[PDB]
């Protein structure tokens, strides 16, 4: 009984960490509850990164990902933190553009660091799940359910007030971009690669495949369904129309255009040449060019 | 690998709305008109040194990105004359030729069939782009059609349909479109006879060089004799192919 005991103590510790990241601030009386960071909460972000490093990577397990997913860390903790940072930074940018050196952030470096760590968890948790041969049996058992949880992740990212986390990610990118080319450290270009990788994770998440065991004979009932969808997630939320709508509303397209057009003159191209191509491919893998030109008409 | 045109049904259609379709059309149009060339040049710079280390995913996505944007610019230039086909002109460099042809050849020799299908799509759209640029202007076009059809690649495109029937429907449709493009681009040279092609010589092709011949070629085409020795060697493997053959 070591395996289920280890599983339940791991799920208990992820539950305690998910309660320890933050709260919706029910003490304050606002009609939308503003999200409030918990005390000593950046250490909780580093603990989620440490848990995803020590268990998920070397030990060849995916228990931490579902332990996070069933307690809604992406849905209820990381996205409100990033959206609150985005809204506060947008309001501060407006008030500083109208009158400079008035109404600053108290702890802007702390907010930028926790926003960067939240984006790191978004990239690390929405990574494309590949299961080749000679992999662990835990990943083979957990692949379909983790693909469904990634579908919930994509729906929640694209649907939460029309995807303000995309605006948060491009704001974290233009924090790097405002620095001059000579003054940019390679960590800043790695942050740019993090943002481009996040956009490729948002685009690249697709519904999983239905795998069956063919050792036993197929009965007379046969395959009744090959649906691999979560309860609240439909095929419309996953589809590319919502991706194009959320990308055009949040100006992701202009961001990709202004990094593609000045790739050689402004940016170190070896950092972001491959995620940019991956983004273009993940748009254009499922689009036929003849149907894009239509030549009461419906 | 993700689900793509290599895995989806031929009858699968993406149903864009009016606003979403217009925004996607504007984004792809500005991508090609702004930085398709710079991105393609940077990627074929990076992958030509990382060619022996890339797993099937980067090969498939590179060939599909190249083929999709070349085909979309071809269709936009066919529909509307405002767009310029030279906006995918960096598709027609020799480095992308070498990369696509080497990816298709290495996919065939290792019996990898997904990258073979993606390279077949990319080669079909490469031939379509060459045919469009040749029909527009009648030059570097004879140089590039000698470059693509060199080596044993005619035998490669010949024996791709012989092995098609075992695989899926999309592989077989790409065999249709690739063979149709091959015969359409090779039937243009039935009367013009310009089919000089670098071929692979098998037995001894050694020739005792003459430095008087070398120096008079130096006077002829204004060349250094080391690269004139290179030209003298490369002239010996040049052959001609028959379109009836």
């Amino acid at each position: 009984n070591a395996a289920d005991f280890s599983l339940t103590v791991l799920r208990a510790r992820i539950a305690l960490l998910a309660t320890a990241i933050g709260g919706p601030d029910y003490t304050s009386q606002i009609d939308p509850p503003p999200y409030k960071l918990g005390d000593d909460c950046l250490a909780c972000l580093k603990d989620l990164k440490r848990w995803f490093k020590l268990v998920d990577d070397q030990q060849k397990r995916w228990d931490v990902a579902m332990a996070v997913a069933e307690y809604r860390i992406l849905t209820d903790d990381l996205l409100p933190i990033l959206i609150d940072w985005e809204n506060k930074c947008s309001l501060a940018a407006k008030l500083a553009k109208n009158n400079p050196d008035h109404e600053e952030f108290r702890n802007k470096a702390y907010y930028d660091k926790i926003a960067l760590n939240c984006l790191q968890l978004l990239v690390l948790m929405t990574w494309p799940l590949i299961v080749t041969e000679q992999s662990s049996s835990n990943q083979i058992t957990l692949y379909g359910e983790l693909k469904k949880h990634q579908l919930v992740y994509k729906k929640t990212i694209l649907s939460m007030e029309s995807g303000k986390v995309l605006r948060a990610a491009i704001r974290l990118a233009l924090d790097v971009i405002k620095i001059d080319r000579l003054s940019r450290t390679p960590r800043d270009n790695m942050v740019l690669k993090l943002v481009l990788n996040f956009f490729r994770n948002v685009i690249a998440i697709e519904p999983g495949e239905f795998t069956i065991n063919t050792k036993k004979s197929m009965p007379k009932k046969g395959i009744t369904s090959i649906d691999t969808l979560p309860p609240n997630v439909s095929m419309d939320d996953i589809s590319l129309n919502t991706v194009i709508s959320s990308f055009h509303k949040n100006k992701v397209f202009g961001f990709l255009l202004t990094l593609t057009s000045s790739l050689s003159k402004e940016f170190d191209q070896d950092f972001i040449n491959i995620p940019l191509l991956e983004i273009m491919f993940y748009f254009t893998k499922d689009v036929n060019q003849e149907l894009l030109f239509p030549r009461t008409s419906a | 690998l993700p689900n793509s045109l290599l895995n989806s049904q031929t009858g699968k259609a993406i149903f864009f709305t009016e606003s979403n379709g217009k925004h996607f059309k504007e984004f792809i149009n500005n991508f090609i008109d702004s930085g398709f060339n710079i991105l393609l040049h940077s990627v074929t710079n990076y992958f030509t040194t990382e060619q022996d280390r890339m797993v099937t995913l980067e090969q498939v996505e590179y060939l599909l990105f190249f083929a999709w944007f070349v085909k979309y610019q071809l269709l936009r230039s066919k529909i509307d004359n405002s767009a310029d086909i030279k906006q995918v002109s960096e598709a027609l460099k020799e480095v992308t030729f070498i990369l696509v042809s080497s990816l298709l050849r290495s996919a065939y020799d290792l019996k990898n069939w997904t990258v073979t299908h993606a390279g077949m799509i990319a080669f079909n759209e490469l031939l379509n782009l060459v045919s469009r640029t040749k029909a527009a202007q009648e030059t570097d076009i004879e140089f590039i059609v000698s470059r693509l059809f060199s080596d044993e690649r005619i035998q490669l495109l010949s024996n791709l349909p012989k092995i098609g029937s075992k695989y899926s429907l999309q592989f077989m449709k790409s065999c249709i479109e690739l063979t149709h493009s091959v015969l359409k681009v090779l039937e243009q040279y039935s009367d013009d006879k310009t089919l000089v092609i670098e071929g692979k010589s098998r037995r001894q092709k050694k020739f005792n060089i003459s430095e008087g011949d070398i120096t008079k070629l130096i006077e002829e085409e204004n060349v250094d004799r080391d690269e004139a020795l290179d030209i003298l060697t490369s002239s010996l493997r040049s052959i001609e192919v028959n379109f009836q053959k």
Partner: peptide, 11 residues
């Protein structure tokens, strides 16, 4: 063990 994969994109 032997497994067969079914895709939703084939429909």
């Amino acid at each position: 063990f032997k497994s067969r994969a079914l895709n939703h994109v084939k429909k």
